[PDB]
C-alpha cells in the first residue's frame, strides 16, 4: 500500500447508530427433533445479553449507559422427511421458561413466538426497550443484594429476556439436527457517558475480571 | 514570433492544444494545507535536443519525474511527498525548408507500458532515464525491458489511433512548433511524484524524415516543459 | 393487508433489469466527487476524434509504421483505393471510428476523411481524389474518375484536403480512390518521394443502435 | 444480407451508462459441503476486479478513470437432502478473510453477507463506490512501493473487495457440489479521459504485457 | 388485486438492511426517556478528548506507569521520537484517538499534541520540539532539527506547549522528536530529574469513513 | 415494510393477461415510426371492401 491523499470531510459513519447498529451472529446452537423425551438437547436457550462475544462486547463497553431496540433475525438450517416448521419463543424478563421440549410454557399467550416453516425468508422478531430503568447499564459498580452480599456487578435492570427455540414437529422417522444462528442488532440506539476502551483480554462472560496487561507494545529505546 | 519569458528563462516561439479543454488550476482545509511555490518552478526547463534521423522510430519521456534533476522543481520533489502541476510542453523542430516529415506529439496520461517478454517485470530503470528519452524500436524486442515496438507504442494499442489524447501534429511542410497544456489528470488531488508517472510525452514520427545528400542528416527536436500551478503539501504546523 | 397477486415473471432473474438493489453498506458514505478533466458522457465522442488510417496495410507492412504511409512519387494505376465502410473493411476497422462501431450492429451516419500531405514544403503536384457511390463500379482510368465525383487537390497550395462521405451504414459500399493528376514537381534540393497520411472520424453526427460483443477479442 | 436505408437519429445506446452498465458473468467456481475439514475447496474467493474476462476488461480500458456502483447478483446451483442455505460474504478492502470454511471471520459484523436459501429468487448485493480516491483507475503508470521498487502498475486505490461464498449447512449425508455464477454490473457509472482501444490480445490478468500484433489485416496491394 | 412481481433479492436476508421489523410486543409501551448527563451522539467526540500517551514504552516499562513518563535530566541524542500516525504505531495506537481509529479503515485529519512539563516550579530549561514532514528523514543532530520545523519551548515561562500535526491519514509518516536546547537549570533545593507527559487528540475536526473490526481483540 | 398478502391467483400464468412485461433490452431505443400508407386500425375495415362472390361454384 501507499500513502494517498485521503481528501474528504465526513463523520456520518462515526455516529452511534452507524457504529453500534450492525447485525452480528451471537448464538450458534444445535437442537434435535426426536428421541430422549426428557432431554435438554431438543431446544435452545441463549439468555439475551450484550456480553456474548468479545468483539461486540468491546463496542458496548465504550459507553456506560445505552438504550436501544433489538431486532434479531434467525438463520435456521437442518441436517439428517416432511417440511419442517420451527418456533422461536421470546420470553420477557418476567416470564416462565420451559424445562422440556413438551412443557406447557410453550403455549403461554404472553410469550410471543414466531412459527417459521423451512424454505421462506428468515424469521425476524423485534423487541423494544424492555428495561425497568431508563437505560441499559454496561457496567454496574454495585451489589444485587443489599448490605454487600454476593453477586457483584449484576443489576436486574439490564435484563433483556430469553429466546427458546424448538421444532414444532412432534416426531420424525430419522434424526434431524437443526442449527440456528441468531443475528443480534441494536436499533434506535442512544448512548451516554463515554468510557475508555478495553485494554486487557476478557476472562468470563459475567464479570470484568482481567489479567494485568501491558499498556502498549514495547520498543527498544525512547528515541528509535 | 513571440518571445515568451517565465522567471529567468526566455524562449522564442512561432496554436495551443489545451488538454481536455481545461487550463491547470490550484486545488481550491486546515487538516491538510497546500504550499504554492510559484517562485521559480514555473520557468522553462529545456531538455536535451533530440536528433531525428531517417531511421528514428520515436521517443518517450515520463513526467513528472522527467524533471527530477531540473532545478527547484527537481529539488521540491525530494522535500515534499505530494504535489501536482500543469506542464506546458513546447516542442520545436527547427528543420529546414527542404526536409520533410511529420510527428505525433501526444501526452497519453497513465501510460502503463508492457514488458518485452511477458511472464515477468522490468527493473524500473527501463521506463525512465530522467532527462534522456527512451527510444521506441521498429520491431519486436526481448529481455526484461519495455516492449518499445511502434504500432503497439507501449500499452498494446494501435499507434495510429493514439490521437484520442491531447496531441499536436508537427508537419514540417507547414509548421514546426507544438504546445500542449495538461491540467494534471489524476484520481486523487495530490500524489507522490516519484511513484506515479502522471503522463507520458511520446513523440512518434509517422511520416519518416527524408532529404537529399546535401542537407544535414538529422533534425533536432527541442522539448521545453514549464510546470504551471505546482503546489505541494504543507511542512509547517497548524 | 394489501391484496397482491404475483404476475408471471416474479422471482425470476432477468439479466437486463434496472431494479433498486438493496445496498450492502447503507451507513457507508462514499467519497465526494472531485472534478477530473476530460469526462466522457457519450461514446460517439470517441468516434469524432481523427486518427490515422492504415491505408498501406499490404502483406508485409502491418507490424511497422509503414502501414500508415501512402507512398507518393506510373500514372495509369491509382495511388490507393479502399472500401468506405468502417465495418468489415481491413483499412477502417481498427480506427477509433471503426472500433467504436464494432460494438454495435445497427449504425448509420457520415464519415469525413483528411489527407495530410507529409512531403516537403517545396514539392508541388496534383492528386485527384474520386468517390464512387455505393452501387457504382470503381473507375478503371483517371478520366473515368474525373467524370464522376472528385476533388483535384493541389498540394502546393493546401496540404490537407477534407472530405465528408455520406450514406455509410450497415445492419457494397463506396470507394475513395486517388490518382496522379500531375506528378510531384520538386526542386533539386528537396527529396523526390513523399508520403500522405489519412484520417477518419464522424463528419457531423453519427447514429448507432444495437449493442453487441466485439469480434476481435477471442 | 442487403444494404438497407438505416434511417434514424439516436445516440442513447452510445452513452456510458448504456455501454458499460450490462450484467456479465465474471466468476464460475465450485465449492463442496462436507469432507476435508481443513480444505480450500469448500468456499469461493474471487477478489473483485474489472480485469476478470477480456470482453469486459476491453470496455473498461476505453477510459482511464471511472467511478461506479456495482450490483452483483449470484446464480447458485447444486448437484449431488435438506433445503440448502448459502452465504455470500463481501469483505471490504479493509477486512479479514477466512482461511477455512469454519473460520471466525465469517461471523464478522463489519462484513455484510446475504443468507440465500435454495429455491427463491437469486441473491442481490449492491456495493457503493468504495475507493479511497475519486475514481477507479483502469491504468496506473506508477509503482506501489516508493523509490521504484517491485509491483509495477498496481495501485491500491482501485481495490474493490472480495466475495467469500460458502454453504451454511454444517454437514450432509452425501456430497453436494454447488456452482456459483457472479453477475457483475456497473451502475451509476461516470468515466473520464478516453483512451484508444486495445489492439493486442491479453496475456495476464494483472499486467498490460502484450505481444506485438499487426495494426490491421493485410491486403494484397494498396489499390485493390 | 395489485399485480406485483418479485425482483431478484426477494426472500433473502441481507445482513445490513434497514427494514421495518414487525414488533413482537405491540401493546407494550416502553419506559419514558429521562435526561441522563453526558450523551454521546458521535464517536469522534471521544477522539477529541486528550489522553496520556505512553512515549516511554520501552521493553520493561509498559506494565507500570513509567510508560507515560518522559525522563528529562547527553545533548547529542534526542529525548524521545516516534512515528506520527495513530494506527500501526506502538506509541499512539492505544490512545483514545488511536483506539477509536482502529475501528475504521479510511481516516484523515489532524492531531494536536500537548507536552505537560511535570517538573519543579523552579526548574528552568529549553526543549526543541521538531516536526518532520511525512516524506522527510529524521534529524540526526539538534542543528538539523533547528533548520526544519521546530518550537523552542521555554519551560521556565510556560509549562504546556501545544502542537497541531496535519496530513495524518491512512487508507511513512511524520516525526515528533525532542531535543535538549539547554539543560534543566535547578536551584540547590529542587530535584534535578523531571518528567514530561504527552497528550493527543483530534486538533480541529477528524474525518473517518470505513468501519471494520478491531485487530486487538482475538 | 408494507404488509402484503398474496391472493388466490398469485404465481400463476393466465394466458390472457395484460401485465407489464420486464423489457429485456432497456437501453435499446427502437426505430422511429415513419408514415406507411394504408394503416388498418380495425378488422371490420376489411369486411367493408367489396369482393367477387363465387355464385357459380358448381362441382366442376
Numbering used by the authors:
A (entry chain S), D (entry chain P): 1043 to 1122, 1132 to 1275
B (entry chain Q): 2013 to 2026, 2030 to 2043, 2048 to 2257
C (entry chain R), E (entry chain U): 3001 to 3073, 3078 to 3175, 3187 to 3233
F (entry chain a): 3001 to 3060
Question: What do the authors report?
Answer:
Viruses from the family Picornaviridae form non-enveloped icosahedral virions that are about 30 nm in diameter. The capsid proteins VP1, VP2, VP3, and VP4 originating from a single polyprotein form a protomer, the basic building block of the icosahedral capsid. The entire capsid consists of 60 such protomers, arranged in 12 pentamer units. Here we show that the exit of the RNA from the particles of echoviruses 18 and 30 requires capsid opening and results in a loss of up to three adjacent capsid protein pentamers.
Specifically, we performed cryo-EM of echovirus 18 virions exposed to pH 6.0 for 10 min, mimicking the acidic environment that the virus encounters in endosomes. Asymmetric reconstruction combined with 3D classification identified subpopulations of echovirus 18 particles that lacked up to three pentamers of capsid protein protomers. We call the particles lacking one or several pentamers open particles. The missing pentamers always formed a single compact opening through the capsid. The absence of one pentamer of capsid protein protomers creates a 120 Å-diameter pore in the capsid. The openings formed by the removal of one or more pentamers are sufficiently large to allow release of the viral RNA, even if the genome contains double-stranded RNA segments. Reconstructions of the open particles missing one, two, or three pentamers with imposed five-fold, two-fold, and three-fold symmetries, respectively, were determined to resolutions of 3.8, 4.1, and 3.7 Å, which allowed their molecular structures to be built. Except for the missing pentamers, the open particles are similar in structure to that of the activated echovirus 18 particle: increased diameter relative to the native virus, reduced inter-pentamer contacts, absence of VP4 subunits, and holes along icosahedral two-fold symmetry axes. The capsid proteins next to the missing pentamers are more mobile than the rest of the capsid, as indicated by the three times higher temperature factors than the remainder of the capsid. Residues 1–42 from the N termini of VP1 subunits, which were previously shown to interact with membranes and facilitate enterovirus genome delivery into the cytoplasm, are not resolved in the electron density map, indicating that their structures differ among particles.
